[PDB]
Design a protein around this ligand. Sequence first.
Ligand SMILES: O=C(Nc1ccc2snnc2c1)N1CCN(c2ccccc2)CC1
Ligand SMILES: O=C(Nc1ccc2snnc2c1)N1CCN(c2ccccc2)CC1
Ligand SMILES: *Cc1c(COP(=O)(O)O)cnc(C)c1O
Ligand SMILES: *Cc1c(COP(=O)(O)O)cnc(C)c1O
Lengths: 429, 429
Amino acid sequence: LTPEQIIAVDGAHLWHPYSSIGREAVSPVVAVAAHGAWLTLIRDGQPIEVLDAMSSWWTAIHGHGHPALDQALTTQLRVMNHVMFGGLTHEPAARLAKLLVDITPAGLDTVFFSDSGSVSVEVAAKMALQYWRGRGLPGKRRLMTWRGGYHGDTFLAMSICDPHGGMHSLWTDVLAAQVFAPQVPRDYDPAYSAAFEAQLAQHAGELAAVVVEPVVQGAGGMRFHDPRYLHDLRDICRRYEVLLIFDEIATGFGRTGALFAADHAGVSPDIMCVGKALTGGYLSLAATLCTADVAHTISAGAAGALMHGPTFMANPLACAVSVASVELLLGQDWRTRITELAAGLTAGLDTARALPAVTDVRVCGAIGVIECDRPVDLAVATPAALDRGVWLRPFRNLVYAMPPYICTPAEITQITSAMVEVARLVGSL
Amino acid sequence: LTPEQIIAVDGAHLWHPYSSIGREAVSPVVAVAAHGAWLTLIRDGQPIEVLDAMSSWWTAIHGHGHPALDQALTTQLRVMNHVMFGGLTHEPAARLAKLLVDITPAGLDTVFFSDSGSVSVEVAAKMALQYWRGRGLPGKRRLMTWRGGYHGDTFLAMSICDPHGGMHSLWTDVLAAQVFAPQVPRDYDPAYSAAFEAQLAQHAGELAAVVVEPVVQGAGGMRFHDPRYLHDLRDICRRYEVLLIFDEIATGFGRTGALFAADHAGVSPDIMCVGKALTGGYLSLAATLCTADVAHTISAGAAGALMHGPTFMANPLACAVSVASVELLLGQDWRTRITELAAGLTAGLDTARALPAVTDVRVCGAIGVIECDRPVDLAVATPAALDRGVWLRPFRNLVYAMPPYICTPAEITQITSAMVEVARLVGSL
Ligand SMILES: O=C(Nc1ccc2snnc2c1)N1CCN(c2ccccc2)CC1
Ligand SMILES: O=C(Nc1ccc2snnc2c1)N1CCN(c2ccccc2)CC1
Ligand SMILES: *Cc1c(COP(=O)(O)O)cnc(C)c1O
Ligand SMILES: *Cc1c(COP(=O)(O)O)cnc(C)c1O
């Protein structure tokens, strides 16, 4: 198919994320290749090379077509593509479970593989519900979070997404009614934690778990946060006997400057979800980890098992590439790499603070954000960034980047320059 | 890792589908390779080659490591592993969407890609609910199905699963309460359809959709029903203004003797789900298709968009292998292939009808089932099958197979002989 034909098929037949059919203001751009930090896109019938400043929605931490990950895929493909995980086990699943147990916050000793972030969140909730049921406390069935969060698109996951961001107002009666604390502030305020505790106290007997994104809230608004809040959550949860679940699907694997965002506080949750960057952005894969205590209590419960099992559970191909991606990250000085990326984002984005339409500039590890005083028009921002050799996709009022870890200092400066120019145009209406 | 080390890691750290940690009656068997119709498994420390009679949970329709599918994946790997589907489109997505629209029942014109069957079911439900909200009828938010079904493991999907199979007993006060008709019979009885209609009629004002597996109910009991029941559901749904959703995640791509099981009835659903065999068993991928009417009504409603978007939506690697898998199926006389498989299953399983423990023997396309009068002991059945060079996994009172389409007459004889002997050992108490 030519790029023209691809566009024709797409407009007529393909849904896109959170999109319409036939009512798109901006046509999608045809991608024809991806290598390292670079995408080959079609612009006016001509292929142009642009920086993947988004890491393809936070996935491509090592860039595209990395030799180590390509080779991991083809070497597994040669021996075993997939086998059912019902009654069978295999080396890729075992290697990956061993790695994940050994690098995640202490105490996370068991691993449930699934195929997506949203599914891993449902699995986490199921673990929490079956746990309390295993303790003879089935009243503990509700979830508590703070506002500003995002946890995926399946119906249980939706129920803990920010009620404003997730337009819950049109899911009246269908969504489970969960407990929401106010938006967690950037700076540490003991008063916020005390109020969080006071609210949790009113619901403790009906709460299975607190579920939050640690340190960085991604899709909900790129808000950062103080890690000390996570210390308070762990204390509150311990004292009131509510499970703590960390959703690290966004973040995990070095993105925030620590290996996992929980590490910024030294906090272990009871259950943890990982996903986006798990395979280095090659293949869909997610994981839900829980403590030995949670696993044993579930296993000793009425069901005698966790009542979940996806078709492609622990897929050998996805597990093999993930093994390679995790080893590639751990086999280098990733901490210094992320610190350098963060330095580059900070230096490059400082000039945006002076721009008329800019309300905030913030950086946390390999995440850089320009917050604007108005929603960013994609019809202007997209071509503007492409003209500067960078693929950016703002959402709401945010011009942001989460670049691949392999981006050179020069490439980071190219990214921040494009971000600044988009922010300048926003004020130019 | 050696098979012994794999077993050690697995016992300590890996959840399996619907499994415990630390309370497994039988250890899983280590799989070390897969090629064509055969798995290489470790038994008594040594590798043995056995037939994958289950197609690795319905997935491996062309067998493992098919050269055409390996090639397709490797070719895509060299150009573009993955890009984000937010604001970008690509050739693998377009090619697959085009194919799927062209081969599915008439009227299914739009394709929403996701990363598993359970998610595609949630997407289907979301389409149905947003559809009625777009028509100004937000009361139409419940689902109706018949008993014996299975639709996945996420919380909304669970709500339409068979109440017994799904142990809904221990999910009281958590699952949405849906409308269940009685188990659909094998043989066609107009009285059943009339009763289904009467039940639907009293709930029509609050029903968004009927959701069923067409012709074959897989995981809920390997039960077959007359295709004419689906003709009746299409009629009932039309007259009472309730959407019809067919979940073809297990039945799709030739398994039942038609390209899609809906084709047995000559009927089109409003929404359709596909999954397990979509990639030929290489990678997790699923799709939810809907009519132009459904897509337009959603897109004109208050959200102005379908509120869903998985991270790995329309993954180029998965879409590439899927295109190859479908073209491989369409490029041969698949209908004759399934007919020969069905014939082989019938002939091989006939001797079981006379066994003392056997209540039924039934075949539908490349699906063969021996139903027993008591549960099948896996501790006895698994080694018995392995001794005969066959991987079988019974569940409940069912010894069954859904073999790869590439299985030779000799391999089908080997599969069925193993199944018959498992059934024989059941009657020995
Ligand atoms: O456009 C997206 N997400 C999105 C999802 C998947 C992909 S894949 N490639 N790009 C994507 C963008 N949104 C997800 C987060 N959103 C949200 C939902 C509930 C609460 C807060 C934010 C709405 C918009
Ligand atoms: O064990 C499974 N699924 C399963 C089995 C084997 C494999 S191999 N890879 N994935 C698998 C999933 N189920 C248990 C009972 N099931 C069920 C049936 C009816 C209603 C609710 C669940 C279907 C899923
Ligand atoms: C993206 C995301 C999810 C959902 O992941 P999918 O793979 O899109 O289902 C869940 N939680 C968080 C924190 C995320 O960033
Ligand atoms: C297996 C199955 C599902 C769920 O698919 P997963 O990929 O396991 O989430 C849904 N519907 C039907 C009919 C199935 O057989």
